[PDB]
């Protein structure tokens, strides 16, 4: 059996020198685990450009499953996102100075898109391996929600066979040295991400525990 | 232009014999402030029945503006909600024992509805009076989001002239006596609610700030 | 039966415009409640000078009870302090630029002083009136702990008949407008402070609970 | 020159079968790193008995440096403690049912004891290795503070040559699976602890920071 799984992580931004989402997905590049064969691409933390880079990664890799990963500084758990919202509302500018306020991602697109990943199943499997996980119901209104909405929009309109979604991850310890915030080690985050890609490759559907 | 503004607050939800959302909106019943003439109705913290009670309050009062209020224990600010989600996913049972998991509120309805209130404007006005306010992007998946989504569905399909939305409020101090959690006094919360009703009755368009 | 209660509050620091500890104790100046007769003085948020101002307030008013109040931004409850510590360790400079690091308050003084107030009784009485309260075991190492330690030192060495202590209070709502943080209204804080002064004037002895 | 460092950790408490402070120090037993030669002993989470077990470990091992470790569920950083307080005030009963309230540890002992470890130095060295650390000024009033005060009392009165202190550690991920709380991995915590032992074995002098 073989499902091709595209993982994306973002580049560094807003002060930081490392984006853990890219550090964790980069080491899974080329991994084969169960049915999953994993490839990893980096997306810029830039509005509009991130979506162009993702469309290119879909053309080049022809994936069956796409999991985009971003950092959510301050959370304590790996959180798969249930909902992408059609809004760009930037509190801070992106890496190229764009700061959209009140802007639609898709003019006339739906208000929201649900995730296509079996996220409750992913949460229970990550937890079986001893690492904290929970589903989140807001992915923010910055570049991470932008890429999630843009991904689901592309799937619905042009690649309906693809199962796609977004997972937010904590800070790693090295990033909370001058500011106390929760974190999870990079080893637990890359392990959780591998479990997510394999669970999404094996399972079509989700379980009803909530 | 006098605008009738319907305000609702939930009945005590198993945990106390008082619900602050009701206590606050009940004292604004009959208040007239600027163009706003305010009426208040209580809604049960029960899935499906809450919506039936709301439909009845809409028929009886014929409101121009509807602001539904509920309690969000743990928050620190008055938070107007930007997005209602088509999902009933109950961690705990409602007042009559219903605990829906993974259920659509409207089968075939949109995934989400945006608020119809000028919420950025409301946030800035509450803050001008010295009380903390912020827009929130998830209203949960319990009876409070249920009523919010049901409200906006009713408006979209049957009462397109009505401006409607949802505002979550914190605990009052009396509720954090055995469990430390943030709170706002009931006098600040009812004041914030009266400012929201007046701001919504005086302006159809929102500010762009965030 | 009449006890003179001296309350003090600090002026503002950091970048705030009101120090709620002064705003609250100022409105209790001249209040008589039960046995207590209350007078209020303001102390500067300056190391070493705060202590000189307090010594002067003790000479002038000849109090039976002294309760020094300061703001603890970020807490959620009124917190009477159990322990003062012999250390000035300033993360930020005070209002006149002093920033002591690793400095003894009293060279050769004890490492700590316990409060002289019936703080468990005070906590239970404030909570009986519906406002959250709890004892704290660190008052920090800035000017608020400095005044507390210096107060207890003054009492132990020169005024052993006086009952003295420190009470930290939260932000008021008006201070959490740009930064979300917990707060208590100024009406709840001044009412908690009047209850603390009256409870301390009526009982020399504390209850034993937590 | 070799310094024998004794580390302690506690036994299981509260429905758990493993205690991280003990899991982390147990794997350092017999380690030699720089000048430090480390031995580890387990202490019961029992008032009064913990102190007797510690006195026995001091007699048997004759250590130059003692670092007692306990878990502080909820914190986000490794926190060396600056102050031990002379008070047993138990919110919950210990492993054998003792629940002291308002009790002195040493009748007539000082109100507090300062740590004997170079804790600022320890904090900067742990952070150099990418793991979060900060000094704490309250170690609670349960069995962890009890052992810290009792240790410093023993040192002051009978073993003035020993350098001793206490370090609180976070939850590990496995413990925050049903309750979301911050954690650090057991590998990061045991690495922090070995760095603490070696920094204390090499430096009697502490540094001056903020």
Euclidean distance between the first and final Cα of chain C, in Å? 30
Tell me, yes or no, whether chains D and C touch by having 3 or more C-beta pairs under 8 A.
Answer: yes
Out of B132, B173, B180, closest to residue C188 by CB: B173
What determination technique applies here? Answer: X-ray
E strands, chain B, in order? 3-10, 32-33, 36-43, 65-71, 79-80, 83-85, 112-114, 163-169
Contact B139/B83 with Cβ under 8 angstroms? yes
Element containing residue C187 per DSSP (H, E): helix C186-202
Q: Please tell me which chains touch C, using 3 or more CB pairs under 8 Å as the contact test.
A: B, D
User: DSSP strand E in chain A: where?
Assistant: 3-10, 32-33, 36-43, 65-71, 79-80, 83-85, 112-114, 163-169
Which one, of B154, B139, B165, B164, lies nearest residue B71 by Cα?
B139
Q: Of residues B41, B68, B125, B144, which has the active-site annotation? A: B144
Cα dihedral sign for C116, C120, C123, C129? negative
Query: Beta strand A83-85 with D65-71: parallel, antiparallel or unpaired?
Result: unpaired
What percent helix, strand, coil does chain A show, rounded to 5? 30, 25, 45
Annotated catalytic residue, options C68, C125, C146, C168: C168
Q: Which candidate, D115, D130, D145, places its Cα nearest to that of D195?
A: D130
Nearest CA in chain A to B99: A210
**Which of C102, C112, C210 is the closest to D111 by Cβ?**
C112
Instruction: Please state the three-class secondary structure of A56-106 as a single string.
Output: HHHHHHCCCEEEEEEECCCCCCEEEECEEECCECCCCCCCCCCCCCCECCC
Instruction: Tell if the CB–CB gap between B184 and C181 is shorter than 8 Å.
Output: no
CA geometry: angle at B139 spanning B137 and B145, to 5°?
A: 135
Catalytic residue among D41, D68, D125, D144: D144
Query: DSSP letter string over D125-190?
Result: HHHHTT--B--BS---SSHHHHHHHHHHHHHHHH-TT-EEEEEEEPBPGGGSSSS---B--HHHHH
Those residues whose C-beta lies under 8 Å from the C-beta of residue A96, and which sit 6 or more positions away, are A44, A46, A49
Q: Do B209 and A89 touch (CB under 8 A)?
A: no
Test mutation, D75, D169, D177, chain A, max A CBs within 10 A: D177
Question: Which residues of A sit within 8 Å Cβ distance of B?
Answer: 82-83, 85, 87, 89, 91, 101-102, 110-114, 137-138, 140-141, 208-210
Q: Give me the catalytic one of D68, D125, D146, D168.
A: D168
Give the closest-approach CA distance of B6 to chain C in angstroms. Answer: 27
Chains B, D in contact, 3 or more Cβ pairs below 8 Å: no
Contact across the interface for B76 and C130, Cβ inside 8 Å:
no
Asked if C173 lies within 8 A of B127 by C-beta distance, the reply is no
Which residues of chain B have a CB within 8 Å of the CB of A138? 137-138
3-state class (DSSP) for residue B107: coil
Q: C36-43 and D3-10: which strand pairing?
A: unpaired
Distance from CA of B85 to the nearest CA of A (A): 8
Q: Do chains D and A touch (3 or more CB pairs under 8 A)?
A: yes
State the best of C89, C100, C111 to mutate against chain D, taking most chain D CBs within 10 Å: C111
Contact B182 C177 (CB under 8 A): no
User: Across the interface, which of B83, B102, B209 has its CB nearest the CB of A85?
Assistant: B83
Contact D127, A177 (CB under 8 A): yes
Using alpha carbons, select from D159, D178, D135, D189 the residue that is nearest to residue D65.
D159
CATH number, domain at D190?
3.40.630.20
Q: Identify the chains in contact with D, defined as 3+ C-beta pairs within 8 A.
A: A, C
Which residue of the set B41, B81, B146, B188 is catalytic? Answer: B81
Of the candidates C76, C177, C183, the beta carbon closest to that of B176 is on: C76
Strands lying side by side in the sheet with A32-33: A32-33, A36-43, A3-10, A65-71, A163-169, A79-80
Q: How many domains does chain B have?
A: 1
B91 vs chain A: nearest CA distance in angstroms? 6
Show residues of chain B in contact with A100, CB under 8 Å: none
Q: Are A18 and A12 in contact (CB under 8 A)?
A: yes
Strands B163-169 and B79-80: antiparallel
Q: What angle do CA C29, C34, C38 make, to 5 degrees?
A: 20
Contact list, D208 vs chain C (CB under 8 Å): 101-102
**Chain B interface, Cβ < 8 Å to C:** 76-77, 127, 130-132, 134, 173-174, 176-177, 180-185, 187-188
Instruction: Find chain D residues with C-beta within 8 A of A185's C-beta.
Output: 185, 187-188
Is B182's CB within 8 Å of C183's CB?
yes
In this structure, what DSSP letter does residue C142 have?
S
Nearest partner of C85 among D86, D117, D123, judged by Cα: D86
> Which residue from B21, B36, B63 is spatially nearest to B161, judged by alpha carbons?
B63
Q: Do B101 and A140 count as a contact with CB atoms less than 8 A apart?
A: no
DSSP state letters, D7-72: EEEEPP-SS-S--HHHHHHHTTTT-EETTEEEEEEEE-SSTTHHHHHHHHHHHHH--SEEEEEEE-
- Round to whole Å and give the CA distance between D41 and D22: 8
Task: Tell me how far the alpha carbon of residue A174 is from its chain's centroid.
Answer: 21
Resolution in A: 2.0
| D158 is an active site residue | no
- The nearest CA of chain D is from the CA of C3 a distance in Å of 27
Residues C67, C7 contacting (CB under 8 angstroms)? yes
Is C208 assigned a catalytic role?
Answer: no
How many Å apart are CA A113 and CA B110, to the nearest integer? 9
The rounded distance, in Å, linking the Cα atoms of C7 and C42 is 9
Q: Which domain holds residue C127?
A: 1-210
Q: Which residues of A are catalytic?
A: 81, 144, 168
Contact residues on chain A for B112, CB-CB shorter than 8 A: 83, 85, 110-112
From residue C150, how far is each of B2, C90, C112, C116, D142 by CA, in Å? 61, 16, 11, 13, 27
- Chain B residues in contact with C23 by the CB 8 A cut-off are none
Dist CA B65 CA B73 (whole Å): 25
A116 φ/ψ angles, rounded to the nearest 5 degrees: -105, 5
| Element housing B122 (H / E) | helix B119-128
According to DSSP, residue D5 is labeled E
* Contact by Cβ (8 Å): D140, D92: no
CA B187 to centroid of chain Cα atoms: 17
- Contact (CB<8Å) A112/B85: yes
């Amino acid at each position: 059996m073989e499902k091709k799984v595209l993982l994306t992580g973002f580049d560094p931004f807003g002060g930081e020198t490392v984006n853990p989402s890219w550090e964790a997905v980069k080491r899974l590049n080329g991994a084969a685990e169960g049915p999953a064969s994993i490839v990893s691409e980096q997306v810029p933390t830039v509005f509009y450009k991130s979506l162009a880079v993702l469309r290119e990664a879909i053309k080049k890799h022809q994936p069956d499953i796409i999991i985009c990963v971003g950092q959510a500084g301050g959370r304590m758990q790996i959180t798969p996102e249930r909902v992408a919202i059609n809004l760009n509302e930037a509190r801070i500018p992106d890496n190229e100075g764009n700061q959209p306020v009140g802007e639609d991602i898709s003019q006339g697109g739906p208000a929201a898109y649900w995730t296509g990943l079996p996220i409750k199943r992913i949460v229970e499997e990550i937890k079986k391996e001893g690492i904290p996980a929970a589903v989140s119901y807001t992915a923010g209104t910055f570049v991470c929600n932008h890429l999630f909405y843009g991904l689901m929009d592309e799937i619905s309109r042009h690649h309906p066979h693809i199962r796609g979604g977004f997972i937010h991850i904590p800070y790693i310890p090295e990033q909370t040295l001058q500011k106390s915030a929760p974190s999870l080690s990079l080893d637990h985050i890359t392990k959780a991400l591998k479990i997510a890609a394999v669970t999404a490759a094996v399972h079509e559907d989700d379980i009803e525990t909530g």
